Write an enzyme that holds these catalytic residues in place. Structure first.
Site, PDB file in Angstrom:
ATOM      1  CG  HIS A  55       3.654  -9.992  -1.467  1.00 30.09           C
ATOM      2  ND1 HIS A  55       3.095  -9.425  -0.341  1.00 30.09           N
ATOM      3  CD2 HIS A  55       2.673 -10.723  -2.047  1.00 30.09           C
ATOM      4  CE1 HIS A  55       1.831  -9.798  -0.245  1.00 30.09           C
ATOM      5  NE2 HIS A  55       1.550 -10.585  -1.267  1.00 30.09           N
ATOM      6  CD  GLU A  57       6.650  -5.128   0.001  1.00 28.44           C
ATOM      7  OE1 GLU A  57       6.162  -5.843  -0.900  1.00 28.44           O
ATOM      8  OE2 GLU A  57       5.953  -4.511   0.835  1.00 28.44           O
ATOM      9  CB  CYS A  85       1.587  -7.988   4.066  1.00 29.04           C
ATOM     10  SG  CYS A  85       2.668  -9.110   3.152  1.00 29.04           S
ATOM     11  CB  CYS A  88       6.490  -7.986   2.984  1.00 32.12           C
ATOM     12  SG  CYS A  88       6.087  -8.601   1.336  1.00 32.12           S
TER      13      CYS A  88
HETATM   14 ZN    ZN Z   1       3.812  -8.405   1.264  1.00 28.61          ZN
END
Ligand code: ZN
Ligand code: ZN
Lengths: 153, 151
Positions: A55, A57, A85, A88
């Site tokens: 991801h 991040e 999310c 993350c």
């Molecule tokens: Zn994420």
């Protein structure tokens, strides 16, 4: 924008989000800043990297640990175009970063107030400060894969 | 007792052996192995300080190694055996991996996100549901919390 400001770093995250155009989902761009210096950059590249954790991040946190030569990134601020999310949000707690700054909320899987609040869970060992709304209009357009091309000169 | 081959206790013992490689890390040693069709596709232990990676957890390396061998960030029908309950970061990676089942031995009453501090894997707002099996080799895994290995 004004140098070394929240909106300044958000523009850097918005540019990085263009690299996630060929990914399933909203394009997310992230940049990790410590003392007004870029120590980590990242965008969504799950399919491009064959990594379920790739991801925006996470890539920024992973690059920051290599630059800082330490898996703990104290007093660092992470700018993301999207609400983190659950995966993350958990990575920011273990990185012990100081602040996460996201533009628009993720009303489906977001873990910073929408679907749940992992960053502000009372059972956590670290508290990451939350700042939302930075470049919200441009970050909200990222939900429909819209990018800005303003007038020049 | 009897530990059949290619069984949950069989793979849990494989993860317990991997946990020895994370003895010099701040925290309890955790070992993880990712299995698909009774074949090892991913292995991992805690290497956060050794690799300067805040995500270098045992379960994440199995998912990262699993994604490399499977040439796909989605690891459908895969089973992840870990010696410890996953944290909020690792549990979030299992939802994105679309693995079929996670098998951890003992709960993590400090950072665990599979029943201890929370239950993210069975949250109704998720796009995938990962089956949970806990307690496999709990005695040998609970001793790992105090850095104890069986001889
Ligand atoms: Zn994420
Ligand atoms: Zn973890």
């Amino acid at each position: 924008e004004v140098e070394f400001s929240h909106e300044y770093w958000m523009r850097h995250a918005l540019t990085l989000a263009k690299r996630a155009r060929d990914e399933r989902g909203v394009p997310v761009g992230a940049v990790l800043v410590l003392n007004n210096r870029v120590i980590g950059e990242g965008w969504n590249r799950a399919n491009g990297l064959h990594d379920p954790t790739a991801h925006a991040e996470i890539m920024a946190l992973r690059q920051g640990g290599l630059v800082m030569q330490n898996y703990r990134l104290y007093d660092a601020t992470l700018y993301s175009t999207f609400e983190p999310c659950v995966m993350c949000a958990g990575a920011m707690i273990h990185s012990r970063i100081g602040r996460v700054v996201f533009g628009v909320r993720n009303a489906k899987t977001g873990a910073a107030g929408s679907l749940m609040d992992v960053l502000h869970h009372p059972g956590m060992n670290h508290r990451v400060e939350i700042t939302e709304g930075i470049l919200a209009d441009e970050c909200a357009a990222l939900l429909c894969r819209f990018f800005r091309m303003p007038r020049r000169v």
